[PDB]
Amino acid sequence: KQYIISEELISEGKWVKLEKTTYMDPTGKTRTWESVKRTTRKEQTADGVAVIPVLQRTLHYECIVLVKQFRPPMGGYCIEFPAGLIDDGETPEAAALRELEEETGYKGDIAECSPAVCMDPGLSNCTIHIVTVTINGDDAENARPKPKPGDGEFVEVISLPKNDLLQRLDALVAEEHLTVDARVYSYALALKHA
Amino acid sequence: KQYIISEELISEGKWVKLEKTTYMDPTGKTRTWESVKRTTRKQTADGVAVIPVLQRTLHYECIVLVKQFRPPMGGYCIEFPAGLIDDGETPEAAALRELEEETGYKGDIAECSPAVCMDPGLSNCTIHIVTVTINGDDAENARPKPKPGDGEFVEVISLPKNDLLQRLDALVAEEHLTVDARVYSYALALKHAN
Ligand SMILES: CNC(=O)c1cnc(C)s1
Ligand SMILES: [Cl-]
Ligand SMILES: [Mg+2]
Ligand SMILES: [Mg+2]
Ligand SMILES: [Mg+2]
Ligand SMILES: [Mg+2]
């Protein structure tokens, strides 16, 4: 029933733009919306990847590997799945494994890759692939993981046990000023609910 | 170590604005970021998203989701019921209200997250994730009345909790919809648990 009629640029930065979207509603009436888009999406199937990294080690409980960084939009520190934008020509899987190594030091193994999923669809067209990766923490490659941050990347690694993830996140939020990401929280809530 | 120095308005719509954020990197170098914010916040968070667990005896437990056209996406998305929190509304009340408006179901609060970020590399947007149970055997949820506001057009899709991720992939394959990242993350963790 519904579709886009026109997309009028309001303001274009180097990374993000704002558009006036005109669309047809299902009564047959024309309406508008304010839409955010990135300027960096070329032929990628999504803007970015977020990695769900399951750290597996003999005689350890499985951990979920998370990262903590300063996020200028939020004006503060956030706890997130490792993530980054997909480089031109790069596959989502390759982007995931690369970002996971850059942000955490770990070399993972692909498990699964989602279709493109929407970040905040009432606001933006932004999409990611959610890529589940296992990390063999018994491998020597992953014994001394050194994050290789790119320019302006400053990332702390936080590994939390899967079997207590929500409470461990709660305990971090209780101790400092820091926001947990909605996908991380959602994943932690389902681990509780299962 | 990191903090905001200043924020310069680039462009302000009725609902969304774009800013150029100046911040201090951990080395003492000053850097800029393009940030999006909503113009609507007052509140604990911009919005709520509801995880609605429909419980009917002798049936599988379902998670109630909504399908709507999303102008920034140019398409239909599958999402947790959700909306912005009204000035002077609590997140719990916003959650029960939105759930009723979007689905017609009347639920009970199970738990409420702290404010969690939507896409912290892009925006300051936050929500509370509110887990709600729905007694599907109660008379008031027999023939649920969805009460849309002006210009809302929402379809309800109930999916079994125990097979959520496979049911979502199926919808994506057959119906060319985009699943929401928080929905997909929750679905993943239901499979990954134990
Ligand atoms: C790296 N510098 C930037 O200004 C941005 C990157 N991603 C954005 C949404 S803004
Ligand atoms: Cl529950
Ligand atoms: Mg990143
Ligand atoms: Mg990165
Ligand atoms: Mg809504
Ligand atoms: Mg509503």
Curated annotation (Swiss-Prot), chain A:
Tissue specificity of this protein: Widely expressed. Most abundant in liver.
Molecular function GO labels: 8-oxo-dGDP phosphatase activity; ADP-ribose diphosphatase activity; ADP-sugar diphosphatase activity; identical protein binding; magnesium ion binding; nucleotidyltransferase activity; protein homodimerization activity; snoRNA binding
Name by which UniProt lists this protein: ADP-sugar pyrophosphatase
User: Which residues does the record give as Mg(2+) 2 binding sites?
Assistant: 99
Q: Which Pfam families match?
A: NUDIX
Provide the function of this protein.
Answer: Enzyme that can either act as an ADP-sugar pyrophosphatase in absence of diphosphate or catalyze the synthesis of ATP in presence of diphosphate. In absence of diphosphate, hydrolyzes with similar activities various modified nucleoside diphosphates such as ADP-ribose, ADP-mannose, ADP-glucose, 8-oxo-GDP and 8-oxo-dGDP. Can also hydrolyze other nucleotide sugars with low activity. In presence of diphosphate, mediates the synthesis of ATP in the nucleus by catalyzing the conversion of ADP-ribose to ATP and ribose 5-phosphate. Nuclear ATP synthesis takes place when dephosphorylated at Thr-32.
List of residues binding Mg(2+) 3: 99, 103, 153
User: In the UniProt annotation, what is the result of changing residue 71 to Q?
Assistant: Reduces affinity for substrate about 5-fold and reduces catalytic rate 67-fold
This chain is encoded by the gene named NUDT5
Residue positions of the PTM Phosphotyrosine?
A: 61
For the cross-link Glycyl lysine isopeptide (Lys-Gly) (interchain with G-Cter in SUMO2), the position is 29
Domain Nudix hydrolase: start-end pairs: 44-184
Where found in the cell?
Answer: Nucleus
Instruction: Summarize the record's induction comment.
Output: Overexpressed in cancer patients with a poor outcome.
Q: Which SUPFAM superfamilies match?
A: Nudix
What family does this chain come from, according to its entry? Belongs to the Nudix hydrolase family.
Binding residues annotated for substrate, in chain numbering: 15, 33-34, 38, 71, 85, 120
- Matches recorded under InterPro entries: Nudix_hydrolase, NUDIX_hydrolase-like_dom_sf, NUDIX_hydrolase_CS, NUDIX_hydrolase_dom
Q: Which cofactor does it need?
A: Mg(2+)
Q: Where does Mg(2+) 1 bind?
A: 83, 103
Quote a single Gene Ontology cellular component term. extracellular exosome
What UniProt keywords apply to this chain's record, in alphabetical order?
Acetylation, Hydrolase, Isopeptide bond, Magnesium, Metal-binding, Nucleus, Phosphoprotein, RNA-binding, Transferase, Ubl conjugation
Q: How is the cofactor bound?
A: Binds 3 Mg(2+) ions per subunit.
- Write down the chemical reaction(s) this protein catalyses: D-ribose 5-phosphate + ATP + H(+) = ADP-D-ribose + diphosphate; ADP-D-ribose + H2O = D-ribose 5-phosphate + AMP + 2 H(+); 8-oxo-dGDP + H2O = 8-oxo-dGMP + phosphate + H(+)
**Phenotypic consequence of residue 99 to Q:** Catalytic inactive mutant for both ADP-sugar pyrophosphatase and nuclear ATP-synthesis activities. Reduces catalytic rate 6300-fold
